[PDB]
């Protein structure tokens, strides 16, 4: 386990820098101020995800249309996954670490106005704690999330996409092989980690539904039409590791 594989070290090196929400924690929370900070933090993280993708081996070789499609389909999962990692890493998964300046502990969640959403997102960090996910496993898993959903008709650079996905799958195995020595144990951990990824498909639509309803509550038939493919099943093709 000593030496970390080059590709994994590369992934760590391209991890975006800390992103701040720009939230003023010296003032009492309000439903509006917290929603405002999340949207601001969200846009910043999105641009960060796009930048990150540009340094990911194999990504820029895909048709630009596939690149756009993949980011569109996975930004929510990537963000909730990163949130889970920060929460697990910095606060033992005991609270939601959206940013250094936006951390919601249990009490803060209960009074945020979106407590149910908090409990759902909290599921990821809690699972990270149980599994004790390593930084190496995390980095490989995150790339797989970016490559976990495609159009029903597939992509333009389909073969290239599949080889890119297959490579990071192999890399996840190396990551696991670092602490898991044994063919039965390493195999079992692969199932656990990838099963966790399969389970995110359902969770992600929950987040998109909450996003839409938060929008509706601020203000249509057209906006709702463009969001359904993100909350409804059968509109895209999730790539499951297990039946």
């Amino acid at each position: 386990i000593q030496l970390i594989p080059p590709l994994i070290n590369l992934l760590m090196s391209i991890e975006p820098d800390v992103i701040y929400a720009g939230h003023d924690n010296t003032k009492p929370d309000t439903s509006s101020s917290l929603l405002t900070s999340l949207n601001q933090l969200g846009e910043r993280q999105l641009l960060s995800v796009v930048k990150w993708s540009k340094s990911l081996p194999g990504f820029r070789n895909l048709h630009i249309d596939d690149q756009i499609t993949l980011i569109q389909y996975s930004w929510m999962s990537l963000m909730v996954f990163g949130l889970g990692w920060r929460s697990y890493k910095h606060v033992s998964g005991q609270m939601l670490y959206f940013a250094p300046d936006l951390i919601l502990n249990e009490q803060r969640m209960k009074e945020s106005s979106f407590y149910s959403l908090c409990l759902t997102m909290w599921q990821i960090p809690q699972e990270f704690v149980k599994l004790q996910v390593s930084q190496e496993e995390f980095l490989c898993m995150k790339v797989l999330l970016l490559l976990n959903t495609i159009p029903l008709e597939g992509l333009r650079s389909q073969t290239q996409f599949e080889e890119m996905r297959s490579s990071y799958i192999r890399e996840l195995i190396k990551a696991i092989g670092l602490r898991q020595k044994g063919v039965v144990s390493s195999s079992q951990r692969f199932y656990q980690l990838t099963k966790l990824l399969d389970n995110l498909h359902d969770l992600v639509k929950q987040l998109h539904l909450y996003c839409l309803n938060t929008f509706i509550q601020s203000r249509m038939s057209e906006v709702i039409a463009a969001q359904l493919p993100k909350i409804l099943a059968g509109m895209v093709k999730p790539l499951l590791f297990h039946k």
Partner: peptide, 13 residues
């Protein structure tokens, strides 16, 4: 609405 943001961000740098 993000497609526009994503598309523009991908071309840039």
């Amino acid at each position: 609405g993000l497609e526009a943001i994503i598309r523009k961000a991908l071309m840039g740098k």
